[PDB]
Amino acid sequence: QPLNKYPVVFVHGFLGLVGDNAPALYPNYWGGNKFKVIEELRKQGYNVHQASVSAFGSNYDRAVQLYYYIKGGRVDYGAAHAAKYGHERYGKTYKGIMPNWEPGKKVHLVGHSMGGQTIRLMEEFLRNGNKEEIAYHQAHGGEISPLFTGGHNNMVASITTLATPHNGSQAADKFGNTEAVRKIMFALNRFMGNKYSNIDLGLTQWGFKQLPNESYIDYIKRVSKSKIWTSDDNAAYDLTLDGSAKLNNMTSMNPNITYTTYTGVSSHTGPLGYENPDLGTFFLMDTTSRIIGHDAREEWRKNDGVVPVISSLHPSNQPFVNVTNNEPATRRGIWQVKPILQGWDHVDFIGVDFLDFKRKGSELANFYIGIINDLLSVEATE
Amino acid sequence: QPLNKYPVVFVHGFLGLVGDNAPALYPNYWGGNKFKVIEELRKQGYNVHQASVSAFGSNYDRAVQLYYYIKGGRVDYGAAHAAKYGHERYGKTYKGIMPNWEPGKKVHLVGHSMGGQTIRLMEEFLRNGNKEEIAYHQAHGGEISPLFTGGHNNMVASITTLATPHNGSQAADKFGNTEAVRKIMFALNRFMGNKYSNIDLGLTQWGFKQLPNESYIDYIKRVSKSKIWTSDDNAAYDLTLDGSAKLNNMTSMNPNITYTTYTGVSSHTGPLGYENPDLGTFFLMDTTSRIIGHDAREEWRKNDGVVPVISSLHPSNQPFVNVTNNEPATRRGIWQVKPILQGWDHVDFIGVDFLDFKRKGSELANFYIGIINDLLSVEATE
Ligand SMILES: CCCCCCCCCCCCCCCC(=O)O
Ligand SMILES: CCCCCCCCCCCC(=O)O
Ligand SMILES: CCCCCCCCCCCC(=O)O
Ligand SMILES: CCCCCCCCCCCC(=O)O
Ligand SMILES: CCCCCCCC(=O)O
Ligand SMILES: CCCCCCCC(=O)O
Ligand SMILES: CCCCCC(=O)O
Ligand SMILES: CCCCCC(=O)O
Ligand SMILES: [Ca+2]
Ligand SMILES: [Ca+2]
């Protein structure tokens, strides 16, 4: 007797930390102080959860971790993957939200931004398996995680994405996947691995956890040899146009799943055809909104501060249909693209823009009730 | 050599730290990143300076410090005033920007916010002295600062005020000045008086400097005895309606000085006649805007975030004329009131609102050059 038959799992994006893993003073990811998504939907009789997965890691690593967060158990990235990229095979161990998750017992998945790519990858592994792992365990025996087997169906009812960079973002390509910024991010991760740190930024599999008796000097020296510094097995790569197109090229539609996208615009056309961020765009996205909005290709300009619209609407090589706000969003197997939220930047989707008074709590509450209602109607039309 | 014959001294208000007295990471007071007032005006040929005076102290302690900042020497707050409020007589010693300042060598005074009040009190001391010190020195001998003796004129060419609370602000009466908030400010002052601190928040004359060999516990006990905790000789008091009316009542017009005010509004009328902050009001003033905006007296409602329009246009019941932006602002002895700058909040005057992209550097630049233009007019017409 929750009102939804299937548990709802909200999956954060690229930078986010949740629950026990957030620093001392740090915004609440799912709703900021505008609408406490988890707490308020629960007060309403819904069974909902926020996943906690790697903040800086690849979609791959995140999809595996999402699997273990739902099922419970010790993260297994796969032998073949671990050896090819140069990081640990085994990771955190999760309590598990639905230990009985299996064909027939389903979950709804909602992902903000990179969360939406993560969800699509995890589901691809459940349905189709991972060819490199099946081959290797056949070549080398031992174990293979049931995440990599293939043949798992009827496990996810829905995949809904909010401001997801399905075709990547120039803010990754031109900033950020660049070498200087990857170093900044990896240095942060090294520092947050220190022996006084209680928080996990998601790259401990590459060596970034200082041992209780290791000096910080020996720590620096050891971790400067990790392959993280030059690998593509990280978020910044995956959020690039190439990195996201690679994910599109190996995913496909499950005809049994309900697909739906939401997209925000927070830029406006300037006298030359370029896009500039609206007053109101959370200010940390000002430069990235300009870089996107000055693209040479006109259709790659309109953006939500960090993801252009042509990237959020749907993966470019996958089937989609434009839907009105009033249509039940209840077609299976095709991306149902919601009308664009005017004025919503990338973080207004999760209510942490505490400086934008145009975007209020009661608006954000209607937006999330609206998604639960669509999910209730997936349940009813099955 | 300089294009202005008389030096310009800019004087910061209540919370302001400038120059080498600002923390490692901290906005530049005079112009933010939008228009670097001191540096650009020097490039363009003007002789200008940024005074450095107590950030938390009374207009009285600040006016004394302004005089020594200009003239040079060791700050003497006056024996009668030290004995009456229970703080040290002698404070910091300044090098002096114009060691030769005396009748005949004038200076232009430009005050932001509380700086406007500080500057009127200083002029008042030059012309009329300070009667309690004159009386004290008469009765007890000793020495008396020449700041307190009176009869020093032709030292100030102009007084210009930006968003100065000439008539006080309800943001002081109702918050900040309240007990709970003075404790906060005094605790910050105690903290930054610690023996590792290189920044002076302007209350060390009340005992807030930890000795090199004094423990933190001892420092706490010693200073918990200071009168600062219950005194009115501080900024929060002086910014209230009563504390600014006390200063109005002891000041008078000087018929040789050119007086000019600017004022901003950043609030808009609600359907009940109340004022709420516009979007773009620097966010830290949203609450103080609402407090001012919801006053019982309608003419006290319009505001710049923290100062009501009525407090900023001119001291009440001192003579004033409304002036245009075009006409010469060259009248003597009379507050010239500049038209209210629409959309400018209290901190847009000094360009530190890095969140508000409506207020451009080119605009802030034009605004300060227009002040300098006026000051050149003052010089040309004397
Ligand atoms: C100048 C005073 C500022 C206070 C204005 C009331 C604003 C309410 C907002 C509450 C949260 C902000 C302060 C908490 C500090 C923090 O979270 O780091
Ligand atoms: C927001 C604070 C930024 C401080 C900059 C220091 C950067 C140095 C790289 C540090 C690497 C490490 O400590 O492991
Ligand atoms: C944003 C930092 C505020 C932290 C709260 C500490 C308040 C304690 C009062 C401190 C007094 C002192 O340190 O002398
Ligand atoms: C950065 C804070 C400065 C404190 C230095 C003063 C040292 C004296 C210690 C008194 C004992 C205590 O600190 O609790
Ligand atoms: C001293 C605390 C530092 C925490 C860094 C958080 C970065 C992130 O949000 O992913
Ligand atoms: C630990 C850093 C303290 C900064 C004090 C800032 C107060 C002020 O602006 O007057
Ligand atoms: C540093 C604060 C991060 C908030 C989460 C996000 O921006 O997606
Ligand atoms: C801390 C707020 C004090 C408000 C008075 C003013 O700045 O004009
Ligand atoms: Ca916004
Ligand atoms: Ca502003």
Residue numbers in the entry:
A (entry chain B), B (entry chain A): 4 to 385
What's in the article?
SA lipase (SAL, also known as glycerol ester hydrolase), a triacylglycerol esterase, shows strong cytopathic activity in host cells. SAL, an ester bond-hydrolyzing enzyme, is secreted in prepolypeptide form containing 690 amino acid residues and is processed into its mature form containing 394 amino acid residues. Its active site is composed of a typical catalytic triad including Ser116, Asp 307, and His349 residues, similar to other serine hydrolases. The SAL crystal structure exhibited a typical α/β-hydrolase fold comprising a central twisted β-sheet flanked by α-helices on both sides.
